[PDB]
Amino acid sequence: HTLVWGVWVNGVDQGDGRNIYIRSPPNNNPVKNLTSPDMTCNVDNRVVPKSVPVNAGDTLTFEWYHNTRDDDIIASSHHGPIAVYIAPAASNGQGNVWVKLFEDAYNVTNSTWAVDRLITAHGQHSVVVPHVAPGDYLFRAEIIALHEADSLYSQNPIRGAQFYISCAQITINSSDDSTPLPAGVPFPGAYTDSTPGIQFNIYTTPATSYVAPPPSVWSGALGGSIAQVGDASLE
Ligand SMILES: [Cu+2]
């Protein structure tokens, strides 16, 4: 149970974004139904009044929280991967539009899931803004909690993979468009009951065997991190 509070651009806090530049849902409950319209941008997908200006190559950091800013972030039970996708804003997230910029699942070097590292990072994970066409975009940050993912939601609706999905409105101003955005995958649609990484038993299956759901990270993606970029307590 987690939500995005706001974003930072090159380590500069853009301020509380909830219902302002984040398409915030009414609460921190997960989406679990893979065919739900809620898979696009969570349960309250609508245009919010602000879009955060960035340039290609900027570091864009998403900041998550549980109940209040810079708290426990997410229950430590909620092990799983983190992904970030981008789509042009005119799509409203509909159709074959979502391109994956970032994936982090289980780190064999560190023996830690991405969610474990997100807690250590006070809720902060980042991407490099790609060199796509200037204009308005949606950045869809997705945490998958796998603590009840041994079942499919479609077999037992009390269980299943939990999707914490947050869509930020970002305007890319300066960009040479050296990597034009291609067509992508649809949400809902990309993840099905047979997709690798959706049904996974963390109690019985070693995390070293986990394969995150496709699609693969786009060849235009410039990377990212799970790391604290800004100190919310200094405000
Ligand atoms: Cu939860």
UniProtKB/Swiss-Prot annotation:
It is an enzyme of class 1 (oxidoreductase). Lignocellulose is the most abundant polymeric composite on Earth and is a recalcitrant but promising renewable substrate for industrial biotechnology applications. Together with cellobiose dehydrogenases (CDHs) an enzymatic system capable of oxidative cellulose cleavage is formed, which increases the efficiency of cellulases and put LPMOs at focus of biofuel research. The catalytically essential N-terminal histidine His-1 is post-translationally modified by methylation to prevent protonation of the histidine side chain, and protect the critical active site of the enzyme from oxidative damage. Keywords: Carbohydrate metabolism, Cellulose degradation, Copper, Disulfide bond, Glycoprotein, Metal-binding, Methylation, Monooxygenase, Oxidoreductase, Polysaccharide degradation, Secreted, Signal. The modification Methylhistidine is found at residue 1. Binds 1 copper ion per subunit. One of its GO terms (molecular function) is metal ion binding. The polyphenol cinnamtannin B1 contained in methanolic extract of Cinnamomum cassia (cinnamon) acts as an inhibitor of catalytic activity. GO terms for biological process: cellulose catabolic process. CDD domains: LPMO_AA9. Pfam families: AA9. Disulfide bonds join 41-167. (1,4-beta-D-glucosyl)n binds at residues 9, 47-48, 58, 67, 129, 140. Transmembrane segments: none annotated. It catalyses: [(1->4)-beta-D-glucosyl]n+m + reduced acceptor + O2 = 4-dehydro-beta-D-glucosyl-[(1->4)-beta-D-glucosyl]n-1 + [(1->4)-beta-D-glucosyl]m + acceptor + H2O. Its EC number is 1.14.99.56. Glycans are attached at residues 33, 110. Its cofactor is Cu(2+). Cu(2+) binds at residues 1, 78, 164. PANTHER family: ENDO-BETA-1,4-GLUCANASE D, PUTATIVE (AFU_ORTHOLOGUE AFUA_1G12560)-RELATED. Belongs to the polysaccharide monooxygenase AA9 family. Lytic polysaccharide monooxygenase (LPMO) that depolymerizes crystalline and amorphous polysaccharides via the oxidation of scissile alpha- or beta-(1-4)-glycosidic bonds, yielding C1 or C4 oxidation product. Catalysis by LPMOs requires the reduction of the active-site copper from Cu(II) to Cu(I) by a reducing agent and H(2)O(2) or O(2) as a cosubstrate. Is able to cleave phosphoric acid swollen cellulose (PASC) in the presence of a reducing agent, yielding a range of cellooligosaccharides dominated by cellobiose and cellotriose. This is AA9 family lytic polysaccharide monooxygenase A. It comes from Panus similis. The lineage of its organism: Eukaryota, Fungi, Dikarya, Basidiomycota, Agaricomycotina.
